[PDB]
Assembly symmetry: D2
Homo-oligomer: 230 residues x 4
């Protein structure tokens, strides 16, 4: 029926000047714009959107919330969870995607997150660049919120809720924004790729995408990016 796969913008942290994280720190102008653009895209092009889901974060939300205002809806239930986020970086943060790179350089910078057995180093509870129990988060076995996090285990964050909650209604129209890897995650498991695949398709923020599927959610009709030339 409908899979609306949207990758936010570029936040305003890491991006711009290298850093960012699972941290949750809004996003610049491109967001609103690109997002509004995407919002512009689903509607204007065609289709509308029945149900929406967000990795309990402001960043992504901005993207999602905006699209809706312009298409001409805004009105609808919405569902917020913690199974839809950017792969927790490791023990880095700030960095600048330079000194880090400058330091170790190599596949290390590239590989770290990527495949497995080596996500970014963990993360202690004595670095403002973590993410623990900001209210919210503590309505979940505290024995959860990760530590390093990869798009692998990430598969699970995606997996349970996917079949469970959304997979439930999807007998209709629903949209789960997320971005960076989640969406990769959604498709990655979804399509073919193969754990070694994906690793090579960041995915265009702003714009928006649909899978189509049917009953047993295997993608019949391919994938449309509204702006294939985006």
């Amino acid at each position: 029926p409908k899979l609306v796969l949207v990758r936010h913008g570029q936040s305003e942290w890491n991006e711009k000047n290298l850093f960012t994280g699972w941290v949750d720190v809004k996003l610049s102008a491109k967001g609103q714009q690109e997002a509004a653009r995407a919002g512009e895209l689903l509607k204007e092009k065609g289709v509308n959107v029945l149900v929406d889901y967000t990795s309990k974060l402001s960043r992504a939300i901005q993207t999602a919330n905006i699209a809706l205002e312009k298409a001409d809806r805004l009105w609808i239930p919405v569902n917020r969870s913690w199974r839809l986020n950017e792969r927790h970086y490791g023990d880095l943060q700030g960095k600048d995607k330079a000194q880090t790179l400058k330091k170790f350089g190599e596949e290390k910078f590239n590989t770290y997150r990527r495949s497995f057995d080596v996500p970014p180093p963990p993360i202690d509870a004595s670095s403002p660049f973590s993410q623990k129990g900001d209210e919210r988060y503590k309505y979940v076995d505290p024995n959860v919120l990760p530590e390093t996090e990869s798009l692998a285990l990430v598969i699970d964050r995606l997996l349970p809720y996917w079949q469970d909650v959304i997979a439930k209604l999807v007998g209709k129209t629903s949209m789960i924004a997320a971005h960076g890897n989640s969406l990769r995650g959604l498709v990655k498991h979804l399509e073919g790729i193969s754990d070694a695949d994906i690793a090579k398709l960041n995915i265009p923020p702003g714009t928006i995408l649909v899978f189509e599927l049917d009953e047993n959610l295997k993608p019949s009709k391919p994938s449309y990016y509204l702006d294939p030339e985006a």
Copy 2:
């Protein structure tokens, strides 16, 4: 604990050039601004906001969604219903709050909505300025969506869900934006006034307000408008 009573902005229909309605048609710039302002208000001043509710409409939402982005949250469950809207006008629409006034003038213009036994004339299903079953709406006994609507019966829209759903969690922090009359409605029943009262306190959009209450939701600590001088 917390009652966050927020009256949107001024849409961009009626307002500006007289008209508007239960119709659902976004809002101008003041909205984003005033709203962002309010959003600015809850947070900046103090407090934060646990749970949010909207009369399944884009207008109000804009106001609500914005405040959240600036305070610095955006992240949280949110609940959308159809028991939180602007008192359906009657059989007017467009008007211009002039010819209508110009035409009948008198308490008629003033009184129509106001008290009772005379809401605006009903409304047929052959005027683009109605509101029937835009998707959504038809997940409700169709034998519902009003026709004229006053802030009286409106009391009920407010009443059932109020005690039922929100009244449920309010053992914590929650915010239900709405505006125009709903909020009047929330307080009107809530405080003293007396059906003949309220009728004289439109309430400042943008800004935001808290009741305080306790257990049996009777307003102990009075009401704060963040900007008493707003």
Copy 3:
């Protein structure tokens, strides 16, 4: 589609030896039996049952829970509310439907609950035969739980949730047991009768009934009692 209208059994309080109430005190053997019978009825006859609702009470539940076990289901979501109960008696209780009758006798005994402007006398919080905040109940504006209660206002208990929650899914199969008056209530508003009507059709517990309806929930196909000769 489906309205399954079931009136419990006869509890084991009032019934048997005159008394009973909104109190919530299980039910005798006929319940299990009659209920199982009804349970027997929906299934055996035909149909099955998608969704179930109960006036947060053990009495009715017994009836509902049983039917399900025998038809051969038991498995399914279920929804419990406080908008589905027996019209709170007044200030009587125990009584015995004799001394009370013996005392005032007249339409008083008969009329009390019945129509209006005279439900049973209220009820204070110093008679074990009330019902206040047994856990549960206090997840509702405390400024609720009635006091006397009639099948009139009762209409409202029925009304909000009816259109709101169930009325939502009923685009499928759902069953809301209740009994005594609720069901009267469900039909009473539903059909014709006329406030002065109903008052003359207690309705067979045990057995079970279906309305049929369609879209705008007006009863197309009449009403089947599985056992018309019950």
Copy 4:
């Protein structure tokens, strides 16, 4: 706070005369009894029970539903999922825990389900002793419902929902019946054992048990079986 860990009865299939399965086929008399007993146990002994969960199955439910009626509640929300069942047998069924045993005998009979890399053989969709999409089940990525199933992967059925949904409220009292392995599953991951452990503690149906925990759900106060001598 409260973990109520209850292992049904003994159904009435496999048990009695060897067979049974993930199939879902009620239970004999001991159930009602033992269950009622357990129901008897939580209440009578002490405590009460705030929230209840069932592996969308009649068998277990019978057990759960009964306890409640006798303790003296029955009234409360209840939550039904498909993440709480008996480890799907494999490709056997009926059997009789004799010919099967008689046939292969050995750890094969004993080991099959047990640890891993050898659950019971799968199961095709041409044996009435499977379990596919009995209504219900098809509100889940169809690409789910297992095939063989072990108490290992089973860990996951337990895992997602556990932290997600219940783990949510457990800041209070809740009970998730299930049985056979689920409960093993609940504790198995929960305590120490070690994949090779559990394998040696079937757990007493009927009766009921509590863990206690706290915040980060690690079992402070040990485990009480109401009837240690049961």
